[PDB]
Enzyme design. Structure first.
Site, PDB file in Angstrom:
ATOM      1  N   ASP A   1       0.850  -1.184   0.000  1.00  0.00           N
ATOM      2  CA  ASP A   1       0.000   0.000   0.000  1.00  0.00           C
ATOM      3  C   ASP A   1       0.889   1.239   0.000  1.00  0.00           C
ATOM      4  O   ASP A   1       2.109   1.159  -0.186  1.00  0.00           O
ATOM      5  CB  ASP A   1      -0.981  -0.021   1.180  1.00  0.00           C
ATOM      6  CG  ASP A   1      -0.288   0.053   2.519  1.00  0.00           C
ATOM      7  OD1 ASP A   1       0.863  -0.409   2.613  1.00  0.00           O
ATOM      8  OD2 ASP A   1      -0.897   0.567   3.480  1.00  0.00           O
TER       9      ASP A   1
HETATM   10  P1  LIG Z   1      -2.263   4.168   1.132  1.00  0.00           P
HETATM   11  O1  LIG Z   1      -2.693   4.669  -0.223  1.00  0.00           O
HETATM   12  O2  LIG Z   1      -3.052   2.991   1.624  1.00  0.00           O
HETATM   13  O3  LIG Z   1      -2.572   5.333   2.181  1.00  0.00           O
HETATM   14  C1  LIG Z   1      -3.742   5.189   3.024  1.00  0.00           C
HETATM   15  C2  LIG Z   1      -4.279   6.557   3.402  1.00  0.00           C
HETATM   16  C3  LIG Z   1      -3.426   7.152   4.516  1.00  0.00           C
HETATM   17  C4  LIG Z   1      -4.205   7.469   2.188  1.00  0.00           C
HETATM   18  C5  LIG Z   1      -5.739   6.430   3.821  1.00  0.00           C
HETATM   19  O4  LIG Z   1      -6.446   5.907   2.720  1.00  0.00           O
HETATM   20  C6  LIG Z   1      -6.509   7.598   4.419  1.00  0.00           C
HETATM   21  O5  LIG Z   1      -6.509   8.691   3.865  1.00  0.00           O
HETATM   22  N1  LIG Z   1      -7.171   7.361   5.541  1.00  0.00           N
HETATM   23  C7  LIG Z   1      -7.968   8.333   6.269  1.00  0.00           C
HETATM   24  C8  LIG Z   1      -7.188   9.520   6.742  1.00  0.00           C
HETATM   25  C9  LIG Z   1      -6.060   9.126   7.662  1.00  0.00           C
HETATM   26  O6  LIG Z   1      -5.744   7.968   7.808  1.00  0.00           O
HETATM   27  N2  LIG Z   1      -5.421  10.088   8.309  1.00  0.00           N
HETATM   28  C10 LIG Z   1      -4.322   9.838   9.216  1.00  0.00           C
HETATM   29  C11 LIG Z   1      -3.308  10.932   9.123  1.00  0.00           C
HETATM   30  S1  LIG Z   1      -2.790  11.636  10.700  1.00  0.00           S
HETATM   31  C12 LIG Z   1      -2.936  10.213  11.687  1.00  0.00           C
HETATM   32  O7  LIG Z   1      -3.932   9.974  12.308  1.00  0.00           O
HETATM   33  C13 LIG Z   1      -1.627   9.660  12.083  1.00  0.00           C
HETATM   34  C14 LIG Z   1      -0.752  10.756  12.520  1.00  0.00           C
HETATM   35  C15 LIG Z   1      -0.020  10.407  13.791  1.00  0.00           C
HETATM   36  C16 LIG Z   1       1.433  10.723  13.780  1.00  0.00           C
HETATM   37  C17 LIG Z   1       1.687  12.190  13.757  1.00  0.00           C
HETATM   38  C18 LIG Z   1       3.135  12.534  13.812  1.00  0.00           C
HETATM   39  C19 LIG Z   1       3.512  13.381  14.974  1.00  0.00           C
HETATM   40  C20 LIG Z   1       4.856  13.071  15.521  1.00  0.00           C
HETATM   41  C21 LIG Z   1       5.958  13.544  14.641  1.00  0.00           C
HETATM   42  C22 LIG Z   1       7.226  13.738  15.366  1.00  0.00           C
HETATM   43  C23 LIG Z   1       8.366  14.009  14.468  1.00  0.00           C
HETATM   44  C24 LIG Z   1       9.622  13.621  15.152  1.00  0.00           C
HETATM   45  C25 LIG Z   1       9.363  12.448  16.052  1.00  0.00           C
END
Ligand SMILES: *P(=O)(O)OCC(C)(C)[C@H](O)C(=O)NCCC(=O)NCCSC(=O)CCCCCCCCCCCCC
Ligand SMILES: CCCCCCCCCCCCCCCCCC(=O)OC[C@H](COP(=O)([O-])OCC(O)COP(=O)([O-])OC[C@@H](COC(=O)CCCCCCCCCCCCCCCCC)OC(=O)CCCCCCCCCCCCCCCCC)OC(=O)CCCCCCCCCCCCCCCCC
Ligand SMILES: CCCCCCCCCCCCCCCCCC(=O)OC[C@H](COP(=O)([O-])OCC(O)COP(=O)([O-])OC[C@@H](COC(=O)CCCCCCCCCCCCCCCCC)OC(=O)CCCCCCCCCCCCCCCCC)OC(=O)CCCCCCCCCCCCCCCCC
Ligand SMILES: CCCCCCCCCCCCCCCCCC(=O)OC[C@H](COP(=O)([O-])OCC(O)COP(=O)([O-])OC[C@@H](COC(=O)CCCCCCCCCCCCCCCCC)OC(=O)CCCCCCCCCCCCCCCCC)OC(=O)CCCCCCCCCCCCCCCCC
Ligand SMILES: CCCCCCCCCCCCCCCCCC(=O)OC[C@H](COP(=O)([O-])OCC(O)COP(=O)([O-])OC[C@@H](COC(=O)CCCCCCCCCCCCCCCCC)OC(=O)CCCCCCCCCCCCCCCCC)OC(=O)CCCCCCCCCCCCCCCCC
Ligand SMILES: CCCCCCCCCCCCCCCCC[C@@H](O)O[C@H](CO[C@H](O)CCCCCCCCCCCCCCC)COP(=O)(O)OCC[N+](C)(C)C
Ligand SMILES: CCCCCCCC/C=C\CCCCCCCC(=O)OC[C@H](COP(=O)(O)OCCN)OC(=O)CCCCCCC/C=C\CCCCCCCC
Ligand SMILES: CCCCCCCC/C=C\CCCCCCCC(=O)OC[C@H](COP(=O)(O)OCCN)OC(=O)CCCCCCC/C=C\CCCCCCCC
Lengths: 174, 99, 52, 459, 87, 69, 128, 54, 178
Positions: free
Chosen positions: E42
């Site tokens: 994916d």
């Molecule tokens: P592939 O084509 O299968 O991708 C699947 C996707 C992601 C496109 C899904 O189809 C999708 O859009 N799903 C619904 C939306 C979604 O999943 N959103 C999630 C994005 S934010 C999420 O919830 C996870 C974020 C958590 C991590 C955040 C990072 C913060 C920490 C960073 C620190 C940097 C240094 C450590």
């Protein structure tokens, strides 16, 4: 050397201590000085001897220009252009000579400080006093004349100084 | 259009006709001789000759004359105990102050 | 080759002038925004974001 | 001085009688010969000036300016033959004639012994310059530039004419020697204040003084390369020479009347350096650098000490050479790309190596880099201003910092970076252009070797 | 300085990394295999593969271009063109 | 494998530097040789007192042979 | 939760933290499409001129010409004397002059007073 | 560059003087060429020169 | 760099770019490989936890909160590849890149120093000159009447044609020119 006058440019007698080695180790400074004398000093001495031999065959002389004295701006009448010209030229020549006198005294001071080294504060007091006196007199003579200085302006400054000294003497006597 | 005006001409390149062009003139011979005279006269004559002429100009500013005069005056004055720098430029006897 | 109509001009005071200015500067009319008419000589030049 | 005046008046018929393809060669060769002859004037006396006759005399202040003018003529010829290839023969000869007339007027201006003859000649220098600008300029603004230049200079200089004739009626003579020997103090009165103002304002407009300087960017940007070279190298030095000459008779009033001009000069030096920091045009940047340096020279002349006058003369010569070189370099770039914008052409160091070297050397001299005569003059002026007051050092330090900033900014913008992709007509540098830069730069370093030749009479 | 890259070397290294991936079966992995149509990964898996290739070859692939590299042959071609490899 | 290195034309800059060096050395080297020979053989004058009743010239007031000439 | 980031003029707000980045109207999408269309048209024109084999010279940039013109030659025709411009001009062009005049005049008056009273260390000040 | 060089140093000296001269020139040269008008002007000038100049 | 940009970034593109940026900054924080692998697995676990989400409003809010968390927790000095824009070795060879138009201004002697290279260069120049009209015709045939709606270019649809606007892409300077 006879190139310059020892009385104008004094140098104290040079006291060099005799070497007193205490080790059997060879002296690298002595060995390198011997090498320098053998490789450099002898060839340069030979070259200078040849050059001086070539010079002695074409010996010619040059002279030092002497200017007779002329009446000064005090003697010149008002707006007498020729006498003013002569006096102004004489004053400019005297100014140049005084500047070179101050230069000589400053050279004395610098050379004495360097020669004395670490005891310069006490051993260069004699040359510091002469420099102080010469600089004081030179400053009083030519301190603030300006870019367009002239014998008339120096004379006016001297008249002002003489008037001030006379007034101070009268006030002290009063 | 409001005028019968010529089109703006294309930039003319001297290297196209003459690969070994000095950029002075279109004619190769004139260009070469212009380069030669400019370089020769300017660099050789003016630079070298004027610089050496200026370096060996006679000491008409009397720098060495003034130094010798100052040496003589210092020697005479310190031999006789007089001050090295005179206190006044002129003679107070010849200066007459107002009453 | 730029004509006299492609140069910056006075401050636009009508929507027609604002539309013409936006077209001149290759900008959308909605995105076009001149400097405020404070008499500082900006004219109809657009006020772009202060970024680098 | 006739041995130098007459060969120029013979450059005239020679130029007009030579063949159509030999004009540049003849003019250049004989201009160089005249410069070589004029090198003999540097042998000056320590007491007084060289009094050739009742009409012309030479001094330690006049001699380097004459040498600079005579050396500058052939360089202008080379640049002109660069940019006037398609002109007709008659118009080429007229251009060379205007240059020759300008040189003759400048020579007689610097060697004139009377203030009125000096005025007549230094006002006669306007006509060839105006004709050159408004006739052979490239852009539309040349007409407005000529009007600004002309009317600024004349509005400055007419009260000078009135004051000069008044002074002659009052004292009997305008001869410089007589007015130096028969000088009398100037009393503090309104009449003396306005006489001082008339003379000083004429030469301050010629300098230029900050607030009286717009004609300088207008004229220098819009003039052809020869006009820009002569305007910055020599024509800005007429004001300094005149101020160094006339201030003999303006004392002691200069001690009190110099405050507005000193404040204007210092603050405007800072302001024009800051303007240079944010210039989108290369010629405008060079012009404002000229304004800053001439403001420094104005400060030197106004404080009027023997250490300041030497600095003023050295800085005048150094600025003449450096500004001429900078204008030539900018013109070569312009001839490549037909535009004056600074950020249009970049990467010229990777496209043109030796020109990058010339840019580096010229920019290093533009800022005071030791032991160049630029630094010698600037340092003497700064020292004299420090003895004058102890905040002038603050202003001078700010000016030096900003000068280095904008010089190196110009160098970095034009030369370093990546080349513009769509500019594909940048042909290799010509031997003529390289020789022009060499002839600008080598004499400056030779002057650094021998600095007593350009320090003026006060040395 | 360093030895020049070759197309065969780039292909060998990309296949080496992909075979060291656990989610990919080494036997059925060929230079024309699609990461999602016939490998079953994916978007996050493709992102991780691109990051592994960045770590492998020591240069960064921009996100605008990395999203389209859906095949080992595409990755090989992209890296070769960026590094100026023609043999 | 050797690859062609694309560079701007250095021929014109090299030619200018060569011409400039040639024309500076065309007169500079003879001037240096002449100065060296003059200094080696016709040395500088020696300072002396003016003989009584003798009026020298300015060149006799100057020291270096080239300056005197 | 996490501390908020306050943008400044010299440290602007990142795109990822901009609230308008997560509130997309259908008109926002068409605005972006129009912007991309304008950029693509300009890019096509520049690329055609750039790749033209018979072009020798500089591709004149109307945007650059407008910028250089508006920076210099368009300022005075569009300047009007307003209270703001008048006050700013008077301040920035007169205040520094009189500030420096006051500073230098005060300093020189103090120095001259010391000179007249004869208690200023002027020894060795030979060069002036 | 903008506030001082391009605006106020232009407005004070060269622009204001040019505007004044242009206005005065328009005033002087804007005449209808009527002998009645400028002969009445002649009469006023004669009266003024007679009375104010003694 | 080699791909024409789009008008906007979809939600998938936004989340994938955030995922890559977070992984890179996490690698910067966790210097060692085992620690980085552990925390990268945890990060992908969070992304997979929120992977299935039918509500686009909730998905956008999750993206917004994740971006704020990233900005708060980003490494002040993240690792940048040497050749990448922030890198120490970035743009180092731009001064060594010289174009072929600059190449053709050579003196005839310099050109004679490389007899074989310039024959092939003349062949390339002939190929370029023989195709420009076909390229411009193909470009103007396929463009919409309004104008180009995107920055992508078409391929060569014919057997003897070259893709339009190819010269500078093909002849761009090598990444290590000198
Ligand atoms: P592939 O084509 O299968 O991708 C699947 C996707 C992601 C496109 C899904 O189809 C999708 O859009 N799903 C619904 C939306 C979604 O999943 N959103 C999630 C994005 S934010 C999420 O919830 C996870 C974020 C958590 C991590 C955040 C990072 C913060 C920490 C960073 C620190 C940097 C240094 C450590
Ligand atoms: C306006 C505000 C103002 O007064 O600004 C002065 C200020 C001068 O600087 P400063 O440091 O304040 O002056 C020091 C003392 O204030 C004044 O110095 P002081 O009090 O020690 O005595 C010296 C004073 C003696 O006082 C007088 O002589 C006053 C009598 C009337 C003088 C009329 C001068 C006419 C000639 C100049 C005309 C053009 C201006 O000298 C002058 O007044 C010099 C007059 C010329 C000044 C500068 C001329 C060039 C201006 C360029 C920019 C123009 C825009 O700015 C200007 O003059 C230029 C801007 C305003 C125009
Ligand atoms: C005088 C030479 C004037 C040369 C003009 C350009 C000639 C040319 O086309 O050259 C290309 C030509 C061949 O280059 P290429 O690779 O074929 O051409 C491609 C590029 O153009 C290659 O471009 P490039 O980057 O290789 O260019 C080489 C050179 C070309 O640029 C320069 O040569 C710049 C020189 C002018 C600087 C201007 C501001 C400073 C003014 C100082 C004035 C001193 C005057 C002394 C008397 C000079 C008489 C002529 O540029 C640099 O080296 C960068 C600037 C470094 C300036 C460092 C200055 C520090 C202060 C030194 C003070 C020394 C005097 C006081 C000492 C007190 C204590 C004893 O190179 C030469 O012919 C070499 C000439 C000498 C270069 C080094 C200059 C050193 C200056 C003195 C440093 C102190 C040590 C003593 C050295 C004694 C010798
Ligand atoms: C292309 C790119 C660049 C472009 C640049 C821009 C364009 C430039 C254009 C040209 C500009 C020219 C400017 C005007 C210059 C005019 C000449 C001038 O003013 O000369 C003044 C002056 C000449 O003295 P003078 O005032 O004519 O005469 C005074 C005395 O009477 C003299 O003393 P004496 O009579 O007792 O004997 C001295 C005599 C004889 O002395 C000796 O023979 C000395 C012997 C030493 C070794 C002895 C031991 C070893 C013997 C081996 C054999 C032993 C056995 C055999 C012995 C003999 C047989 C028994 O030697 C001389 O006179 C030498 C004169 C040299 C004149 C040079 C003229 C240059 C003309 C301008 C064109 C230049 C173009 C460039 C090409 C030049 C040629 C390559 O000084 C020099 O020429 C320079 C001398 C420097 C010596 C070393 C000084 C110390 C160096 C280290 C300092 C600290 C480190 C600094 C860094 C390193 C150094 C930079
Ligand atoms: C050499 C190096 C460089 C040297 C420096 C060179 C550069 C600097 C020097 C030059 C500086 C600028 C030139 C001087 C100002 C020229 C102003 C001008 O011509 O304006 C015509 C311009 C066109 O006239 P308009 O079309 O009828 O009016 C259009 C306005 O937008 C509509 O007007 P509004 O109705 O909005 O006005 C409201 C308000 C606007 O005024 C303000 O907001 C200024 C506030 C402070 C004013 C003064 C306060 C103290 C007043 C009482 C003093 C009592 C003493 C006993 O009016 C007032 O405050 C009443 C008049 C105040 C006195 C004005 C004297 C003239 O009018 C204005 O700009 C209006 C304001 C004028 C005064 C502004 C402040 C001037 C401060 C000068 C200090 C020296
Ligand atoms: C370490 C760093 C060193 C870097 C510099 C190294 C340069 C080589 C060393 C210096 C050269 C050897 C010394 C040469 C020097 O001595 O000569 C200078 C002289 O150089 C020339 O005078 C410079 C001439 C400058 C004028 C050029 C005119 C050419 C036309 C230019 C027209 C434009 C001019 C515009 C303004 C006038 C200084 O005069 P001076 O040492 O005592 O001469 C000695 C001879 N004496 C004893 C009899 C007096
Ligand atoms: C509008 C306001 C304009 C103000 C600026 C002045 C410019 C207009 C000039 C009109 C003259 C005004 C000043 C008149 C000064 C004057 O006549 O006296 C000077 C004095 C008179 O002495 P006597 O008459 O003999 O008195 C004997 C006492 N027992 O004569 C002189 O010294 C010669 C002075 C020449 C007049 C100088 C007038 C100009 C003054 C400076 C202005 C020039 C500035 C240049 C402009 C450049 C920048 C804009
Ligand atoms: C009581 C005594 C005082 C009487 C007057 C004394 C005169 C003082 C000096 C006057 C300067 C003479 C030049 C100005 C004359 C009028 C200029 C003018 O007409 O302005 C309009 C003019 C445009 O119109 P035209 O070019 O004629 O063509 C129009 C086509 N549609 O505007 C301009 O931009 C031209 C201005 C000329 C250049 C600017 C003048 C230079 C600076 C003048 C003052 C100098 C400062 C002193 C230092």
């Amino acid at each position: 050397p006879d190139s310059w006058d020892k009385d104008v440019y004094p140098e104290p007698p040079r006291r060099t201590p005799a070497p007193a080695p205490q080790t059997s180790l060879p002296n690298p400074v002595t060995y390198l000085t011997k090498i320098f004398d053998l490789l450099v000093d002898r060839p340069v001495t030979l070259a200078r001897e040849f050059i001086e031999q070539q010079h002695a065959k074409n010996r010619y002389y040059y002279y030092h220009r002497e200017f007779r004295r002329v009446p000064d701006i005090t003697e010149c009448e008002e707006k007498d252009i020729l006498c003013m010209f002569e006096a102004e030229m004489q004053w400019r020549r005297d100014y140049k000579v005084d500047q070179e006198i101050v230069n000589i005294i400053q050279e004395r001071l610098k050379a004495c400080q360097q020669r004395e080294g670490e005891s310069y504060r006490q051993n260069c007091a004699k040359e510091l006093e002469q420099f102080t006196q010469v600089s004081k007199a030179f400053q009083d003579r030519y301190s603030d004349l300006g870019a367009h200085y002239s014998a008339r302006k120096c004379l006016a400054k001297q008249k002002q100084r003489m008037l001030a000294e006379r007034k101070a003497a009268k006030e002290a006597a009063a | 259009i409001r005028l019968q005006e010529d089109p703006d001409p294309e930039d003319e390149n001297l290297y196209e006709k003459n690969p070994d062009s000095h950029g002075y003139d279109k004619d190769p011979i004139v260009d070469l001789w212009n380069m030669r005279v400019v370089f020769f006269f300017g660099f050789s004559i003016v630079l070298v000759l004027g610089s050496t002429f200026v370096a060996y100009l006679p000491d008409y500013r009397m720098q060495e004359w003034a130094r010798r005069e100052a040496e003589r005056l210092v020697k005479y004055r310190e031999a006789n105990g007089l001050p090295l720098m005179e206190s006044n430029c002129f003679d107070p006897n010849k200066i007459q102050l107002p009453e | 080759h730029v004509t006299k109509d492609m140069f910056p001009g006075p401050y636009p005071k009508t929507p027609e002038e604002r539309a013409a200015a936006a077209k001149k500067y290759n900008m959308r009319v909605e995105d076009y925004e001149p400097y405020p008419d404070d008499g500082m000589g900006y004219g109809d030049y657009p006020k772009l974001p202060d970024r680098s | 001085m006739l041995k130098i005046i007459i060969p120029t008046t013979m450059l005239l018929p020679m130029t007009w009688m030579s063949k159509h393809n030999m004009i540049w060669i003849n003019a250049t060769v004989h201009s160089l010969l005249i410069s070589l002859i004029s090198l003999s004037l540097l042998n000056q006396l320590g007491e007084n000036s060289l009094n050739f006759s009742l009409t012309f005399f030479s001094d330690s202040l006049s001699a380097p300016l004459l040498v600079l003018t005579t050396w500058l003529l052939p360089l202008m010829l080379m640049a002109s033959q660069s940019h006037l290839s398609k002109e007709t023969t008659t118009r080429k000869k007229l251009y060379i004639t205007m240059l020759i007339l300008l040189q003759l007027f400048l020579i007689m201006t610097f060697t004139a012994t009377e203030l009125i003859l000096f005025y007549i000649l230094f006002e006669a220098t306007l006509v060839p310059t105006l004709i050159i600008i408004t006739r052979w300029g490239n852009q539309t603004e040349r007409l407005n530039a000529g009007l600004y230049f002309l009317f600024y200079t004349l509005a400055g200089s007419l009260p000078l004419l009135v004051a000069l004739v008044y002074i002659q009626n009052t004292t009997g003579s305008l001869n410089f020697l007589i007015i130096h020997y028969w000088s009398h103090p100037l009393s503090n009165s309104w009449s003396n204040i306005f006489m001082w103002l008339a003379c000083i304002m004429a030469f301050m407009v010629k300098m230029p003084l900050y607030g009286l300087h717009l004609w300088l960017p207008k004229a220098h940007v819009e003039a052809p390369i020869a006009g820009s070279m002569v305007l910055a190298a020599v024509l800005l030095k007429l004001g300094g020479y005149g101020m160094m000459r006339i201030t003999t008779i303006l004392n002691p009033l200069t001690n009190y009347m110099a405050y507005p001009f000193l404040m204007l000069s210092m603050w405007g030096m800072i302001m024009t350096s800051s303007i240079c920091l944010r210039q989108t045009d290369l010629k405008s940047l060079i012009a404002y650098s000229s304004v800053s340096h001439m403001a420094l020279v104005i400060v030197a002349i106004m404080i009027q000490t023997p250490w300041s006058f030497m600095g003023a003369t050295a800085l005048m010569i150094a600025h003449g050479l450096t500004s001429s070189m900078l204008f030539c370099l900018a013109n070569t770039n312009y001839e490549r790309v037909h535009s004056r914008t600074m950020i249009l052409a970049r990467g010229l160091q990777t496209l043109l190596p030796l020109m990058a070297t010339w840019w580096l050397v010229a920019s290093l001299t533009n800022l005071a880099l030791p032991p160049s005569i630029n630094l010698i003059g600037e340092l003497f002026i700064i020292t004299a201003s420090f003895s004058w007051s102890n905040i002038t050092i603050i202003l001078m330090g700010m000016n030096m910092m900003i000068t280095a900033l904008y010089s190196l900014y110009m160098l970095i913008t034009t030369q370093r970076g990546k080349y513009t992709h769509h500019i594909n007509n940048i042909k290799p540098s010509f031997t003529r252009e390289n020789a022009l830069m060499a002839l600008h730069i080598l004499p400056l370093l030779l002057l650094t070797l021998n600095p007593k030749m350009i320090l003026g009479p006060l040395y | 300085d360093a030895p020049p890259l070759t197309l065969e070397a780039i292909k060998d290294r990309v296949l080496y990394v992909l075979k060291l991936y656990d989610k990919i079966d080494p036997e059925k992995l060929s230079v024309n295999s699609h990461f999602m149509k016939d490998l079953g990964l994916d978007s996050l898996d493709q992102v991780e593969i691109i990051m592994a290739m960045e770590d492998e070859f020591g240069f960064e692939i921009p996100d605008i271009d990395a999203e389209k590299l859906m095949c080992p042959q595409e990755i090989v071609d992209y890296i070769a063109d960026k590094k100026d490899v023609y043999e | 494998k050797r690859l062609f290195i694309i560079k701007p034309s250095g021929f014109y800059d090299r030619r200018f530097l060569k011409l400039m060096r040639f024309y500076i050395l065309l007169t500079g080297i003879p001037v240096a040789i002449g100065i060296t020979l003059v200094n080696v053989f016709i040395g500088e004058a020696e300072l002396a007192d003016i003989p009584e009743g003798y009026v020298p010239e300015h060149w006799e007031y100057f020291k270096h042979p080239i300056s005197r000439w | 939760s996490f501390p908020k980031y306050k943008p400044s003029r010299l440290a602007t707000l990142p795109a990822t933290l901009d609230p308008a980045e997560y509130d997309i109207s259908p008109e926002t999408r068409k605005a972006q499409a129009e912007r991309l269309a304008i950029r693509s048209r300009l890019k096509r024109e520049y690329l055609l001129q750039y790749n033209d084999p018979n072009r020798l010279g500089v591709i004149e940039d109307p945007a650059l010409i407008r910028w250089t013109y508006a920076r210099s030659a368009n300022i005075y025709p569009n300047f009007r004397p307003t209270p703001k411009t008048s006050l700013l001009g008077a301040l920035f062009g007169i205040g520094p002059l009189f500030f420096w005049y006051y500073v230098f005049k005060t300093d020189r008056d103090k120095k001259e007073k010391l000179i007249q009273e004869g208690k200023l260390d002027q020894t060795f000040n030979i060069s002036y | 560059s903008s506030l001082l060089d391009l605006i106020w140093l232009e407005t004070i000296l060269p622009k204001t003087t040019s505007f004044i001269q242009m206005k005065m020139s328009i005033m002087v040269s804007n005449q209808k060429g009527l002998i009645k008008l400028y002969f009445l002007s002649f009469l006023i000038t004669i009266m003024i020169s007679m009375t104010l100049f003694n | 760099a080699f791909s024409a940009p789009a008008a906007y970034l979809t939600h998938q593109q936004k989340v994938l770019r955030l995922y890559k940026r977070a992984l890179r900054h996490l690698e910067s924080w966790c210097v060692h490989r085992d620690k980085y692998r552990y925390f990268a697995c945890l990060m992908r676990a969070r992304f997979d936890e929120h992977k299935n989400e039918k509500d686009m409003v909730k998905a956008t809010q999750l993206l917004r909160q994740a971006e704020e968390e990233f900005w708060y927790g980003q490494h002040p000095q993240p690792y940048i590849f040497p050749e990448s824009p922030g890198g120490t070795s970035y743009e180092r060879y731009e001064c060594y890149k010289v174009p072929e138009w600059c190449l053709d201004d050579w003196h005839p002697s310099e050109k004679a120093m490389y007899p074989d290279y310039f024959a092939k260069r003349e062949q390339w120049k002939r190929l370029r000159r023989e195709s420009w009209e076909r390229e411009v015709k193909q470009l103007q045939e396929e463009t919409p009447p309004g104008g180009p709606r995107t920055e992508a270019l078409p391929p060569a649809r014919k057997e003897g044609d070259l893709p339009p606007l190819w010269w500078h892409i093909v002849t761009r300077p090598r990444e290590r020119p000198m």
